[PDB]
Amino acid sequence: CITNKKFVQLEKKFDARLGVYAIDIGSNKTIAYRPNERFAYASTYKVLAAAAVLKKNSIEKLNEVIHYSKDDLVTYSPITEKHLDTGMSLKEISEAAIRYSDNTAGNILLQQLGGPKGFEKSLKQIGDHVTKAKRFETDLNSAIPGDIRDTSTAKALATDLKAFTLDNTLTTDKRMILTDWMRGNATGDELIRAGAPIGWEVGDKSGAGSYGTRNDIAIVWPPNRAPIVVAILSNRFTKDANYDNALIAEAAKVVLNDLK
């Protein structure tokens, strides 16, 4: 009950709705708050779409150069906008999507999987019947009340990230490529990483959307311990609401101190 009380008070403090699911791989202990309620996933899909692309493609296909036109570029494409001339491989596109949250990279990953519905199919293959994927960037970030397009739950996202990174669903080389892309990125510095003790390495994928949507999903490696998977999703109640990263950092501290 005590952990539940902290999450209730975070919702009051930040005027927000909060979804939490975390699993300690060593003890199987879990922490859950609104774990089955839907939130817009925003940019967090990019790590799952990248993992699905790695799973389904040979190293040869993943290194082939893709060319895209200036007309495929959507807003917030800091990496892909530089490479109209050289093109990028699916490996490079995956890294751009995960490290920098590049939206055109996200779109190319969704396209490689057969569009949003093909990405959803890839998730059903790993047992996720919850996530609903319908739109491309940047429309997928609208986070409209009552809309289930481009939504998932904290439990489903955490379970998906665990499936790709810790359940031995990718070969060692692809798995380590994926988790390295998740480590050390500025987009994650104020989120789960800000709630993790120093020395507990965090690999994450952040997200942000309308209605104050602010998300982070992560693997955490505590010293001398098995990993922890953590998904923390949040939104607010008016279209223009500004999120506060501290909500995610403070929720992550609750999770990581209690699974300690």
Ligand SMILES: *C(=O)N1C[C@H](NOS(=O)(=O)O)CC[C@H]1C(N)=O
């Ligand atoms: C992902 O949610 N997005 C991509 C980009 N980076 O934000 S993130 O670091 O929180 O992922 C801008 C916000 C959002 C988007 N598509 O608008």
